[PDB]
Amino acid sequence: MKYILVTGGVISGVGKGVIASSFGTLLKSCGLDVTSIKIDPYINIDAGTFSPYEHGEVYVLDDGAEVDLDLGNYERFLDVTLHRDNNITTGKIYKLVIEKERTGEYLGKTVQVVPHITDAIQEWVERVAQTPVQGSSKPQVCIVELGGTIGDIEGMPFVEAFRQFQFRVKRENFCLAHVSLVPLPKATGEPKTKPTQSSVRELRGCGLSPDLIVCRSEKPIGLEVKEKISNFCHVGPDQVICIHDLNSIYHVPLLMEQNGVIEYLNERLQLNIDMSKRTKCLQQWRDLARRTETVRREVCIAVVGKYTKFTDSYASVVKALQHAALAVNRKLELVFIESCLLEEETLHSEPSKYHKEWQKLCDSHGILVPGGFGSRGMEGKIRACQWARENQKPLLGICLGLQAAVIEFARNKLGLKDANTTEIDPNTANALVIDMPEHHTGQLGGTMRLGKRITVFSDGPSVIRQLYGNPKSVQERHRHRYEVNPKYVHLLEEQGMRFVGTDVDKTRMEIIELSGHPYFVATQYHPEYLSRPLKPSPPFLGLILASVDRLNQYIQRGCRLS
Amino acid sequence: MKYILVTGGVISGVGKGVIASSFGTLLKSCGLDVTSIKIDPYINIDAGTFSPYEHGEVYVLDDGAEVDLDLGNYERFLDVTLHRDNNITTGKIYKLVIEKERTGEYLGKTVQVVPHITDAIQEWVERVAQTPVQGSSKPQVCIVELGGTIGDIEGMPFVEAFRQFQFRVKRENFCLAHVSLVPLPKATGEPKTKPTQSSVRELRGCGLSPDLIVCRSEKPIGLEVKEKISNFCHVGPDQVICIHDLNSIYHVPLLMEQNGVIEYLNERLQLNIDMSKRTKCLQQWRDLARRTETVRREVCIAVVGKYTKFTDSYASVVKALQHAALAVNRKLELVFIESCLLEEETLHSEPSKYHKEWQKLCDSHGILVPGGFGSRGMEGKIRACQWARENQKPLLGICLGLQAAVIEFARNKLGLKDANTTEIDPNTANALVIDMPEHHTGQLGGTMRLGKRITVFSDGPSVIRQLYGNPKSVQERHRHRYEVNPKYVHLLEEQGMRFVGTDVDKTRMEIIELSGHPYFVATQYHPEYLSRPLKPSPPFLGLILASVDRLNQYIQRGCRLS
Amino acid sequence: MKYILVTGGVISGVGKGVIASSFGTLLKSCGLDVTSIKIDPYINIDAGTFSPYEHGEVYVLDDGAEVDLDLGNYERFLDVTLHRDNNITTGKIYKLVIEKERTGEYLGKTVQVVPHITDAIQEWVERVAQTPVQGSSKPQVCIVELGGTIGDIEGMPFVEAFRQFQFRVKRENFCLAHVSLVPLPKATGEPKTKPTQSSVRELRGCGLSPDLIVCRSEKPIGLEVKEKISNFCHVGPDQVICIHDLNSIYHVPLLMEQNGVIEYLNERLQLNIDMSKRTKCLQQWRDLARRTETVRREVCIAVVGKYTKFTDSYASVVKALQHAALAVNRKLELVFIESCLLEEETLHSEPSKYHKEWQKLCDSHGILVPGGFGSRGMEGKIRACQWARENQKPLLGICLGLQAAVIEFARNKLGLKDANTTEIDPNTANALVIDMPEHHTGQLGGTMRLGKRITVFSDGPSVIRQLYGNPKSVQERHRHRYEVNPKYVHLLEEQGMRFVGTDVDKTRMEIIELSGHPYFVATQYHPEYLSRPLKPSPPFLGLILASVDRLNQYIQRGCRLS
């Protein structure tokens, strides 16, 4: 079995997830099973005890628990699924060592880092290899990657363990794809390659040998720069690949083919390949770019979030909008609006940036508010939700934001100003949204709704049911813990707020709709995880068509993409 | 508060415990409270899950659990006690981090190694400082040491954490005592110092600065060697201290005074000292050497163990015999006899070392057999115990070995060849020694007798009771888990094997004696831990006097040392 | 062409010259040309501007100039010669770079360390390979070694240059032999392997891979130590070779054959070998040990030098006496006597070591005084030379010491107390020994007699001429610069001091003899360089036979070894 190792670089966060994922989807279409194993050098859990919406997201995509967010790029471009055994953290390894010492497995003697730690990491590689995906036999090539940069204490046991794994097998059963960054300030002009030389030198100071020189830059360099890397890094002249800032994320496989580095992996691993045209399939990557960079209608989509610009807490949101806009020929035009600048405190302090966010919201035709962080910015989303329901604007809620929209409907339409959720102010007389935990078999205390959860519909004629082909039982991931109190839901029966989304026990509300509004859908799960370029998410298709008034003609034809 | 840091060196096992302990006992007599904090970089537990008798011992000296064996040198030369909070291991720190992330202490964000791991180590230093010994106020100078060498991965987080702790306080509130080794092969002659130059270079490659140059050698060097290292290490000429292979372990404080390095710590920390003669007390260290290197009677002491030479599994045994031989003017003459080379299989294989171990044992007049390791060498100690009871030879069993002596008495004197303990062969008809665990309040399953355990005497006129001054309740450490079955003890009542040592419930037997024999005491606890140069252990005094026939005259005078 | 690289290790002085030289003499007898290339990381010249007799010697053996002393072990066990191009120093490389920048070779641009220095070192390797010894064709395997330890700044450009040289050729055209040291103090006992682990870690932190694990110790270790090296160093179990302190220097090839590491080099380089018995020749190394460790007559040899013990300034002297004592069955018994402790100032100061050096010299029957250092200890050699000519004691002067013997003959026999050489006190009336430089073609100023110099005999019947077979012109190395004044040599013609050794111009005196004395030969050249185990030096054979009165019977038989 082959193994592809992708170490860190000078920086961590430029886009190393889509670089190592290009080699997996290139060999998957040829007839080779490719698996992914994520390594996290952080001491804390990657997503178990991590912050909700701050410096990351809770990446839960077909898994009983939660793993790192970097596994998203290894599943969209491919077609396989992963489990909790793929993501390996330093904190998880420290839990099993204590259990083995207490029982008695190391002959009662003390353990160190070698050969007591380098051998334990190699054992987890064999357990994932022998357990492939549901619908295969045995993987042939694996994609191993690690987080962080190079030259850290948390990354030393990983390099020492991977240096011995290649000696146990044959020489052609292991490779290395080192990634680097080539900085170029705007005040110098000349590509002074010096930080890259220090990155490739530290990797060679352990026992490894870089084979695939990956350099990240910002513009296509000429030929005098590659001649210096051949002697400074002491590698081959054809192993240096030039990578610049691409326009999107699907242009990575289209760049390595032009440089001529696909056949280098075949002569390094000594394997067979049954190609049809040129290496990988050309009837999928080239045809996808012909539906985006051509004719565009320029759709204006303005959302409200926590930060005024793009960051790491909105990575899975900006990627799902690109896969849903290429089907109806639309251009990605997204602007970030901070929820803190939509309250009465902003107008009383700095009214200059306050009115600027309102000019970009009323002119748009699409509202997609995700979730907040605590009680910071809850009043800003209330004034933005009432503007869409009174001006026939499309509104869609992913998660958490539904709790702030059900309160607004009870104050303007109904008339319950005291109604408030128990998370912000539990001392209230109208407990609309309370905390309803789940007590499963074997679990103690108040757990959280996360994992393999199946939801059951209720009503018949619904705009969300026809998107999935009129089913009866759909399964989707969850992460929310607060539910709606079934005591105060009797008042909403006489109004237009209908409950078309329940659970198994018919005691929790998830998908709700409003009668009379042309497009007002609010749910609780996350449809961006169950999306892919081969088949986008149905909920994200109803929001794009409603922004351009092209939704009524999609159901009459029979829904070609359901 | 002052802090003395003692890092590693070139070698790890030459005797770093007696080097850092010399600075603690020197300032304790002046009126300054000195505490010790042990740092273990090993991943496995230092003594919890460590092997019994193999590469170490279970050091339990006034503590609810067990700590490292290196803490013995910091308690014999001084007069204070330590707890479980002094010994800090890497595995113990990894247990509390998981508890803090699950509850919610690091603001939900992830943690790394800086400043997430360097600040957690400094918090444990303040907890031990605020909790001194029972009978003091607040310590002024601490002795911080760590195991292993220099340059390992397990020692990197410790150097980075200690490099910042000195910046939080003043400059004169922290010091460093770097120890090194100066090798000199017998085929070279010239003191080619080179490994020492590389040890002081790696320590300065982090942020620390060596202050007390400690170099271990084998002979007093001249003046051309000290001037050569001063320019390589870039330190002061008076900071280099010459340390060679001493004769014992109490000659360390007597060596640093002649070099003139005691007053250097006063000008570095800016403290006061009320001395009487010259710095430390001269009426204790100089008077102790006048009772050992003078007149000796040359006593032959031969014991049976696991290895033929000295190692790390018999460190606390060779140190307790030195403190008990200087009171009656004796010379240390101990020979190690392997128990595996005393069975019938060794005689039929290699009889060269078979009769050699018996020749040195029969000429001696004292048997002190400790404990074995599993069932490897149990039949060898049976042949050596059956002769000490017939040729009026003194015998003293520390631990575990008592189980092999009670079976021999049931075969030769009684006549039960089928009697055998349940540890070796549980399928027997005469279960003499079984496994009797203890079920305390809050503990589940079968625990092990270890910690604060108090034993109660039984008989009156006993040779072991008069050594302590005829008490009524004595407390001593334990570690054994197997006990004697109270069903088969009724047969021993009609013979000379009396039970003069029971527990609280009067169901476990620890101290046993034999009638008619001049000196045959077999116990279960370890008297070597409760010993000190100021007052040696009573049990080890009755064995030395019995080898020279000077025991009957010790009780008539009234026991001046009881 | 194959290349064997032998880097440094923990220590640099224990005997690394005979370790790398064992692989050269093993393949030379099979029919493979072996060459040696010495690398000196020191900035100063290895022997040009180095001190005369202090921390080394001026190794001049068949070369126009002088090279390092470490090249002596690569010529005694073998049978080839080297030149000045084999020894490469850092100071010599810094001289050629300045000549290339001034003329114009690097395209006028600046140069750095890579790839500006790693490529220049590889060019000198090809120049020595294309220029073999006089009487061969082309070498097949080379022995490359360097001085100093591992991790120094002076040794960084050498490892980086050798790391790229192996990539230019094939994989089986380069090897590596890392030598380390395993210390073991007498106070520990257990072979704590820790300094060896740090030496092999720094070598792997550059790009190299250790192939031949060489560990130096002091006693044959068991099997539990080699199992730790296989996992700590991450190498093969059969690559670890155990080397302890041998008895002499010719026991190195006899140790590698028993471990079974000779056939490992054949499978690594893929070469052919035509062996007769077992690998190397067994009719030379085994037969040599049968003439030394058998019957010995115990000859007492006492010489006077600068240090009281063996050091680095007397390396070539102790090796030449071993090759001359095995021919007549003698045991090496040499004692070092300091010349500074033989004057009148030492007697008035510390008379303890004064008569001790005279007691060991009078009992011997052979004086072999080398040369001193300046004017420190010149009066001590006068009292030791005046007695050898009166008590029929054999005396042999290597170099420099002849100047102190000609003055003694002019004071006791003649009567010129004012006669003194111009080096110590030039202001004298009887300039016996003056400074007579040589002005060759092209050389300016006063040069030094060193290099290819041919001496011419004078008299006929001489004890030194019959040792070489009565020649007429002999060539020998020199290094002395002071000569005898041809004006005061007319007085010695009437006495027994005859001049049987002149130069070409018949103006310089080198070999002198004394009439009436049984054996009193004083020369100026160094016979220890022109010696080898296959044919020892004639002058060193006449001194051994004179100590046992077995010299008159050696000339009558016809000199079987001339």
Coordinates of C-alpha atoms in Angstrom, one line a residue, chain A residues 233-471:
Chain A
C233 CA 17.0 22.6 -1.9
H234 CA 19.3 19.9 -3.6
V235 CA 16.4 18.3 -5.4
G236 CA 15.5 17.6 -9.0
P237 CA 14.7 20.4 -11.5
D238 CA 11.4 18.8 -12.5
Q239 CA 10.2 18.4 -8.9
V240 CA 9.6 22.1 -8.4
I241 CA 6.0 23.1 -9.0
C242 CA 4.9 26.7 -9.3
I243 CA 1.6 27.5 -7.5
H244 CA 0.2 31.0 -7.4
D245 CA -3.0 32.5 -6.0
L246 CA -5.8 30.8 -7.9
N247 CA -9.3 32.3 -8.6
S248 CA -11.2 29.5 -6.7
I249 CA -10.5 26.0 -5.3
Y250 CA -11.2 23.7 -8.2
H251 CA -8.3 25.1 -10.3
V252 CA -5.7 23.0 -8.4
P253 CA -6.0 19.8 -10.5
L254 CA -6.0 21.9 -13.7
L255 CA -2.6 23.4 -12.7
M256 CA -0.5 20.3 -11.9
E257 CA -1.4 18.8 -15.3
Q258 CA 0.1 21.7 -17.3
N259 CA 3.4 21.5 -15.3
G260 CA 3.8 17.8 -16.1
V261 CA 4.0 16.2 -12.7
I262 CA 1.3 13.5 -12.9
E263 CA 3.5 10.9 -14.5
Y264 CA 6.2 11.5 -11.9
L265 CA 4.1 9.6 -9.3
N266 CA 3.7 6.6 -11.5
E267 CA 7.5 6.1 -11.9
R268 CA 8.0 6.7 -8.2
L269 CA 5.4 4.1 -6.9
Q270 CA 5.6 1.7 -9.9
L271 CA 1.9 1.2 -10.3
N272 CA -0.6 0.8 -13.2
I273 CA -3.2 3.2 -14.5
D274 CA -5.9 2.8 -17.1
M275 CA -6.5 6.3 -18.5
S276 CA -8.9 7.3 -21.2
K277 CA -7.9 10.7 -22.4
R278 CA -5.0 12.4 -20.5
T279 CA -4.2 11.1 -17.0
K280 CA -7.4 12.0 -15.1
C281 CA -10.9 12.5 -16.4
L282 CA -11.2 15.5 -18.7
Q283 CA -15.0 15.4 -19.0
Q284 CA -15.6 16.7 -15.4
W285 CA -13.0 19.3 -14.4
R286 CA -12.9 21.2 -17.8
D287 CA -16.7 21.1 -18.2
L288 CA -17.2 22.6 -14.7
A289 CA -15.3 25.8 -15.5
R290 CA -17.4 26.4 -18.6
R291 CA -20.5 27.1 -16.4
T292 CA -18.9 29.7 -14.0
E293 CA -16.4 32.0 -15.9
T294 CA -18.8 32.7 -18.8
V295 CA -22.2 34.4 -18.6
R296 CA -23.3 35.7 -15.2
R297 CA -26.4 37.5 -14.0
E298 CA -24.7 39.2 -11.0
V299 CA -26.9 38.2 -8.1
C300 CA -26.6 40.3 -4.9
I301 CA -26.5 38.2 -1.8
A302 CA -26.0 40.1 1.5
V303 CA -25.7 38.2 4.8
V304 CA -25.2 39.2 8.4
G305 CA -22.5 37.6 10.5
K306 CA -20.0 38.3 13.3
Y307 CA -17.0 39.8 11.4
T308 CA -17.0 42.4 8.7
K309 CA -14.8 40.3 6.4
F310 CA -14.0 36.6 5.6
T311 CA -12.3 34.5 8.3
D312 CA -12.1 30.9 9.4
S313 CA -15.5 30.8 11.1
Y314 CA -17.3 30.9 7.7
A315 CA -15.3 28.5 5.6
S316 CA -18.0 25.9 4.9
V317 CA -20.5 28.7 4.1
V318 CA -18.6 30.3 1.2
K319 CA -17.8 27.0 -0.4
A320 CA -21.4 25.8 -0.5
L321 CA -22.6 28.9 -2.3
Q322 CA -20.2 28.3 -5.2
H323 CA -21.4 24.8 -5.9
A324 CA -25.1 26.1 -6.0
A325 CA -24.5 29.2 -8.2
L326 CA -22.8 27.4 -11.1
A327 CA -26.0 25.4 -12.0
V328 CA -28.1 28.5 -12.8
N329 CA -25.1 30.7 -14.0
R330 CA -24.5 33.1 -11.1
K331 CA -21.5 35.1 -9.9
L332 CA -20.4 34.9 -6.3
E333 CA -21.1 38.4 -4.8
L334 CA -21.1 38.1 -1.0
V335 CA -20.6 40.9 1.5
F336 CA -20.1 40.4 5.2
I337 CA -22.2 42.6 7.6
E338 CA -21.4 42.7 11.3
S339 CA -24.4 42.0 13.5
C340 CA -23.1 44.4 16.2
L341 CA -23.6 47.4 13.9
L342 CA -27.4 46.8 13.6
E343 CA -28.5 48.0 17.1
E344 CA -29.3 51.3 18.7
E345 CA -25.9 51.6 20.4
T346 CA -24.1 51.9 17.0
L347 CA -26.3 54.8 15.8
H348 CA -25.6 56.7 19.1
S349 CA -21.8 56.3 18.7
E350 CA -20.6 56.0 15.1
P351 CA -23.6 56.5 12.7
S352 CA -21.3 56.5 9.7
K353 CA -20.9 52.8 9.4
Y354 CA -24.4 52.1 10.7
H355 CA -26.3 53.4 7.6
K356 CA -23.8 51.8 5.3
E357 CA -24.9 48.3 6.2
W358 CA -28.6 49.1 5.6
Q359 CA -27.9 50.3 2.1
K360 CA -26.4 46.9 1.2
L361 CA -29.2 44.9 2.8
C362 CA -32.4 46.5 1.3
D363 CA -30.9 46.5 -2.2
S364 CA -30.1 42.8 -2.0
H365 CA -32.6 40.0 -2.6
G366 CA -31.3 37.2 -0.3
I367 CA -31.0 36.8 3.5
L368 CA -28.9 33.9 4.9
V369 CA -28.1 34.6 8.6
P370 CA -26.1 31.7 10.2
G371 CA -25.5 31.6 14.0
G372 CA -24.1 33.9 16.6
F373 CA -21.7 33.5 19.5
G374 CA -23.3 33.8 22.9
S375 CA -25.4 36.9 23.4
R376 CA -23.1 39.2 21.4
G377 CA -25.2 40.6 18.5
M378 CA -28.6 39.1 19.2
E379 CA -30.4 42.5 19.0
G380 CA -28.8 43.2 15.6
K381 CA -30.4 40.2 13.9
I382 CA -33.9 41.1 15.2
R383 CA -34.0 44.4 13.2
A384 CA -32.7 42.6 10.1
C385 CA -35.3 39.7 10.2
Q386 CA -38.3 42.0 10.4
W387 CA -37.2 43.8 7.2
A388 CA -37.3 40.7 5.1
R389 CA -40.7 39.5 6.3
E390 CA -42.3 42.8 5.5
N391 CA -40.7 43.4 2.1
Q392 CA -41.2 39.9 0.5
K393 CA -37.5 39.2 0.8
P394 CA -36.2 35.7 0.8
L395 CA -34.9 34.6 4.2
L396 CA -33.2 31.4 5.2
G397 CA -31.8 30.3 8.6
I398 CA -29.1 27.7 9.1
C399 CA -28.9 27.2 12.9
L400 CA -29.3 29.1 16.1
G401 CA -30.7 32.1 14.2
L402 CA -34.2 30.5 14.3
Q403 CA -34.3 31.1 18.1
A404 CA -34.0 34.9 17.4
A405 CA -36.6 34.8 14.6
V406 CA -39.3 33.0 16.6
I407 CA -39.2 35.7 19.2
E408 CA -39.6 38.5 16.7
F409 CA -42.7 36.9 15.3
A410 CA -44.2 36.8 18.8
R411 CA -43.6 40.5 19.4
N412 CA -44.8 42.1 16.2
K413 CA -47.5 39.7 15.0
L414 CA -48.5 38.2 18.3
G415 CA -47.5 40.6 21.0
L416 CA -45.3 39.0 23.7
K417 CA -42.4 41.4 24.5
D418 CA -41.5 39.3 27.6
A419 CA -41.0 36.1 25.6
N420 CA -37.3 35.3 25.6
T421 CA -35.1 32.2 25.4
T422 CA -33.6 30.7 28.5
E423 CA -30.0 31.0 27.2
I424 CA -29.9 34.8 27.3
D425 CA -32.3 35.5 30.1
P426 CA -33.8 32.5 31.8
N427 CA -35.8 34.6 34.4
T428 CA -38.8 35.2 32.2
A429 CA -42.6 34.5 32.3
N430 CA -42.9 33.3 28.7
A431 CA -40.4 30.5 28.3
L432 CA -40.6 30.1 24.5
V433 CA -37.2 28.5 23.8
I434 CA -36.0 26.2 26.6
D435 CA -33.2 23.6 27.0
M436 CA -34.5 20.1 26.2
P437 CA -31.5 17.6 26.4
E438 CA -31.6 14.0 25.3
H439 CA -31.1 11.0 27.5
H440 CA -29.9 8.1 25.3
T441 CA -29.1 4.5 26.4
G442 CA -25.9 4.5 28.4
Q443 CA -25.4 8.3 28.4
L444 CA -25.7 10.2 31.6
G445 CA -26.6 13.8 32.3
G446 CA -27.7 16.3 29.6
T447 CA -26.2 15.3 26.3
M448 CA -26.2 17.3 23.0
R449 CA -28.1 16.4 19.9
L450 CA -25.2 15.4 17.6
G451 CA -24.5 12.4 15.3
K452 CA -26.7 10.1 13.4
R453 CA -30.1 11.7 13.9
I454 CA -33.1 11.1 11.6
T455 CA -35.9 13.7 11.3
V456 CA -39.5 13.0 10.3
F457 CA -41.7 15.4 8.3
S458 CA -45.3 16.3 9.3
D459 CA -47.2 18.3 6.7
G460 CA -47.7 17.4 3.1
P461 CA -47.7 20.3 0.6
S462 CA -44.5 22.1 1.6
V463 CA -41.9 23.9 -0.4
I464 CA -39.1 22.1 1.4
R465 CA -40.5 18.6 0.9
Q466 CA -40.7 18.8 -2.9
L467 CA -37.0 19.7 -3.1
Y468 CA -36.0 16.2 -2.0
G469 CA -38.5 14.4 -4.3
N470 CA -41.3 14.1 -1.7
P471 CA -39.8 11.7 0.8

